[PDB]
Homo-oligomer: A and B are copies of this chain.
Amino acid sequence: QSDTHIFIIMGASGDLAKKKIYPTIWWLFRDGLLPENTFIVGYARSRLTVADIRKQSEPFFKATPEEKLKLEDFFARNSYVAGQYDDAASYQRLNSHMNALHLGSQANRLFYLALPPTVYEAVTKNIHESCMSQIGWNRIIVEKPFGRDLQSSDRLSNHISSLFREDQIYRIDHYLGKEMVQNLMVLRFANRIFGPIWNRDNIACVILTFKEPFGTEGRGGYFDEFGIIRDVMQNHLLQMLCLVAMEKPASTNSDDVRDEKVKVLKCISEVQANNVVLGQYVGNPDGEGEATKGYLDDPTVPRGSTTATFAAVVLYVENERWDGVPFILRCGKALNERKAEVRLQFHDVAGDIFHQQCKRNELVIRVQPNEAVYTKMMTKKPGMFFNPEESELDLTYLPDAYERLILDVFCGSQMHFVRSDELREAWRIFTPLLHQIELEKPKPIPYIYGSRGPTEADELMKRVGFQYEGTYKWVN
């Protein structure tokens, strides 16, 4: 026997709904991954119909002629309820319509909050007042931003926690669903070869990279209020750091894994400005098309903006495993490439017998693009003398990340979602730096659209212990 589920999309008229949520639920229904009795209920202020949602989402549905019957079966279970986000009568009508569905009283209710955070308090409070199922479970999906600093995020989290349990709150982060990011735990904890070296005695530095080759591309005003740190560092690179640095969990249960992640975060001190390099991209006169416009060339960006589109920060995990190992978090927009990557550079071999010709070993876990795991190491040069040369061992070798995250919410797996204590630790790490940046308005270092970013970032990486050589040559 299988229970019925109601997927309540609140804010279904928004861009996020039609472009990502409705197509994702459609793909999950197409492959039979959803529970059989799944009803999708929209909820927004705009007066639309299921026909309107179909019309605005089918270009993103990737709907091919073959499964048109399944398409019209999908919107058969779809429905819409118009109402306001702070009007109790609208929530009463929403609850009645959910109860008007087949087996709507014992159904599991999954609320996806595709709304700006400005209405999150009211939406969550009203959902807890009137739209909570008395038999099935009730889980809410919350989207970023989760506040802008420690205080505002703490306010929002305390409000949501005052109504919902931690097992009901799913703060969705699309990177925690990516294949390499989830493979990190198997790589670290299923293998003997990576166990004894994964510590400060063998690792010189850890580099976590998130590069984008495109700038703000028109919507620079929305980016201006947050900046690169809040946008990327505070969530993506910090989750990456937690996965890289965490102790082995007692089990693969979500609670144990998130316990280990928050335990790592609690061992990190607040970031100091001397360990931070900020940059803001400028236009490329030799660039072609969109690369010629700088961050300030966007009309929506306020004039004189000091918002950083690039950041390189050094964190330290002050515990037994990691003491003294710099964790370099590097992210930026309008850079030379797209790349999300974990790099461990190992210490020199103690007692070198090859006359300083050896290079530091490196383990690279490239999350994207073209997922790869390779370790740069030394091998004998084919020849006559005893000279090592750099080589590498390369790892050789379905629903996407968002689909699997939604499936996880369906199955109640919370390992790939940000816990409240994890969020608060993340905000406390970066809040003094964010306040200093907002207060002093330091001028970011300009860098040209399509470059690697400020050179001061490379200087900072070199200063904290990373050594780039440039002698490693690789051919596919």
Chain A positions within 8 Å of B, measured between CB atoms, are: 179, 182-183, 185-187, 189-197, 200-202, 247-252, 256, 259, 263, 266-267, 318-324, 346-351, 353-354, 358, 360-361, 363, 373-375, 377-380, 382-384, 386, 388, 391-399, 404, 407
A346 nearest in chain B by CB position: B192
Shortest beta-carbon distance from A422 to chain B in Å: 14
- Inter-chain CA distance A374–B348, complex, in Å, is 22
User: A-B pairs with the 9 shortest C-beta distances?
Assistant: A393-B393, A190-B378, A319-B351, A183-B380, A323-B350, A192-B346, A320-B351, A186-B380, A196-B196
For this complex, 20 residue pairs linking A to B, each with C-beta atoms less than 8 Å apart, are A182-B380, A185-B386, A190-B349, A190-B377, A191-B349, A192-B202, A193-B197, A193-B346, A194-B377, A195-B197, A195-B202, A196-B196, A196-B202, A248-B319, A259-B263, A267-B351, A318-B351, A319-B350, A379-B395, A394-B394
A195 smallest CB distance to B (angstroms): 7
Q: List chain B residues, Cβ under 8 A from A361.
A: 191-193
Q: Decide if B354 touches A190 in the complex (CB within 8 Å).
A: yes
Q: Nearest Cβ distance between residue A352 and chain B, in whole angstroms?
A: 8
Known: A186-B379, A186-B386, A321-B350. 9 other contacts (CB 8 A): A189-B353, A191-B358, A193-B361, A193-B375, A250-B319, A252-B353, A318-B351, A373-B393, A392-B396
Do residues A191 and B252 form an inter-chain contact, with CB atoms below 8 A? no
Q: Pick the contact of A252 from B351, B354, B363, B398 — CB < 8 Å? A: B354
A349 interface neighbour in B189, B252, B351, Cβ under 8 Å? B189
Q: Which residue of B lies closest to A373 (CB)?
A: B393
Report B-chain residues with C-beta under 8 Å of the C-beta of A179.
380, 382
Q: Which residues of B contact A196 (CB under 8 A)?
A: 196-197, 201-202
Nearest Cβ on chain B to A358's Cβ, whole angstroms: 5
CB pair A190–B388 under 8 Å, yes or no, is yes
Q: A183-B380, A361-B191, A395-B392 are in contact. Are A247 and B247 (CB under 8 A)?
A: yes
**Which residues of B have CB within 8 Å of A186?**
354, 378-380, 386, 388
Residues of B within 8 A of A187 (CB): 377-380
Contact of A377 (CB < 8 Å), options: B193, B249, B251: B193
Give the nearest-CB partner of A193 in chain B: B361
- In the complex, what's the smallest C-beta–C-beta distance from A310 to chain B, in angstroms? 31
Query: Chain B residues with Cβ under 8 A from A351's Cβ?
Result: 248, 267, 318-323
Cross-chain contact of A379 among B183, B379, B391, B394 (Cβ < 8 A): B183
Which residues does chain B contribute within 8 Å of A200, judged by CB atoms? 350
Residues of B within 8 A of A191 (CB): 349, 358, 361, 377-378
Closest to A190 in B: B378
**Contacting pair B407 A252 (CB below 8 A):** no
- Identify which of A350, A388, A407 gathers the most chain B CB atoms within 10 Å of its CB: A350
Question: Within the assembled complex, what's the spacing in Å between the Cα atoms of A460 and B336?
Answer: 49
Q: How far is the CA of A252 from the CA of B353 in the complex (A)?
A: 6
Q: How far is the CA of A222 from the CA of B413 in the complex (A)?
A: 46
Q: For residue A249, which residues in chain B have a CB less than 8 angstroms away from its CB? A: 353
Q: Chain B residues near A185 (CB, 8 Å)?
A: 380, 386
Report B-chain residues with C-beta under 8 Å of the C-beta of A183. 379-380
Chain B residues with CB under 8 Å of A394's CB are 393-396
Q: Give Cα A56–Cα B106 distance, bound, in whole angstroms.
A: 62
Q: Which residues of B contact A358 (CB under 8 A)?
A: 190-191
Q: Measured between C-beta atoms, what is the minimum distance from A72 to chain B in Å? A: 28
Question: Smallest distance from the beta carbon of A406 to chain B beta carbons, Å?
Answer: 12
User: What is the bound-complex CA distance between A249 and B320, given in angstroms?
Assistant: 10
Known contacts A378-B191, A391-B395, A393-B394; A350 and B320 CB within 8 A of each other: yes
Closest to A399 in B: B384
Q: Which residues of B contact A392 (CB under 8 A)?
A: 395-396
What residue of chain B has the Cβ atom nearest to residue A202's Cβ? Answer: B192
CB distance from A448 to the nearest CB of B (A): 34
- Which residues of the other chain, B, contact A375 by a CB distance below 8 angstroms? 193, 393
**A361 to B201, alpha carbons, bound, how many Å?**
18
Return chain B residues, CB-CB under 8 Å to A404.
Answer: 384
B393 and A374 contact, CB distance less than 8 A? yes
